[PDB]
């Protein structure tokens, strides 16, 4: 769990304190606000609603025909996908100290306090060699900036989170 290269300490990505430069996927989902789940449901209902509204505005074959259940289900799955991506990005920018993250900061503080009390490592221990840990951290560093393009999440318990 010993880092191999030097990393920035308490770097400020915004106007809020840094919680985790490269938070884990389970970490990001666990630190998710109810508003983010509201966003997920909003998108999950919006794509089918968007399809229905587009059908109402301009029917495909002239006559108004509601889309078949297959299109509704595909739109529901894609809506859950886009909502989950937006929620993950919002939680990440909370971790990056860009938006308001006071409650997340307090939960993070209590969490590593409990972990240190239990006698564990701060960001986990891995199945990967330290070189692979560094490669994973360098690949997944700030990968949320490309949410428009590709999905990529940190599934490696690497120590390169930019904290003390």
């Amino acid at each position: 769990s010993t880092p191999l290269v030097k990393t920035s300490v308490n770097y400020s990505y915004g106007d809020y304190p840094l919680i985790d430069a490269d938070p884990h996927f389970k970490r990001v989902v666990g630190y998710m606000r109810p508003s983010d789940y509201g966003v997920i449901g909003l998108a999950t209902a919006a794509l089918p609603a968007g399809i229905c509204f587009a059908e109402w505005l301009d029917p495909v074959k002239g006559k108004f025909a509601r889309p078949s259940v297959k299109f509704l289900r595909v739109a529901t799955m894609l809506g859950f996908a886009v909502g989950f991506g937006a929620a993950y990005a919002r939680s990440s920018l909370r971790f990056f100290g860009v938006t308001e993250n006071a409650r997340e900061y307090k939960k993070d503080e209590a969490q590593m306090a409990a972990r240190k009390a239990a006698g564990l490592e701060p960001y986990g221990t891995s199945s990967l060699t330290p070189e692979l840990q560094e490669i994973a951290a360098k690949n997944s560093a700030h990968s949320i900036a490309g949410l428009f393009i590709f999905p990529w999440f940190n599934f490696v318990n690497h120590p390169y989170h930019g904290r003390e």
Partner: protein, 122 residues
């Protein structure tokens, strides 16, 4: 390049021959004048150097020579039986895994495209 690319080249050409379909041979004399103009321009560009060639052609002169042999030294810093393909796999799967995924999308394109432009759907 041989068992796939060249095989497919020869396959496609053989498809053109069994039912004899001679390919029409168009005249390139249409494009010859532009080649004339461009190549004369390039020769003139190489020509007005003249005096400056005495300090530039010499670079190529010692470039051609290369009359020194590389010295090969041995060391024992390597213990693992690592070959070139192993290093390729390591870099492509860890350092440049994103490139591997984008080439996966490229192969996906190479699968989809021929299907899209070769068959008439329904």
């Amino acid at each position: 390049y041989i068992g796939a690319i060249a095989v497919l080249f020869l396959f496609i050409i053989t498809l053109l021959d069994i039912n004899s379909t001679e390919l029409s041979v168009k005249s390139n004399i249409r494009d010859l004048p532009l080649v004339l103009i461009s190549l004369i321009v390039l020769t003139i560009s190489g020509l007005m150097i003249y005096s400056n060639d005495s300090i530039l052609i010499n670079k190529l002169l010692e470039a051609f020579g290369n009359d020194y042999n590389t010295i090969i030294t041995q060391d024992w810093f390597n213990i693992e039986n690592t070959t070139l393909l192993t290093t390729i796999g390591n870099v492509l799967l860890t350092n440049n895994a994103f490139i591997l995924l984008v080439l996966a999308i490229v192969l996906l394109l190479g699968i989809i495209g021929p299907i899209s432009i070769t068959m008439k759907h329904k």
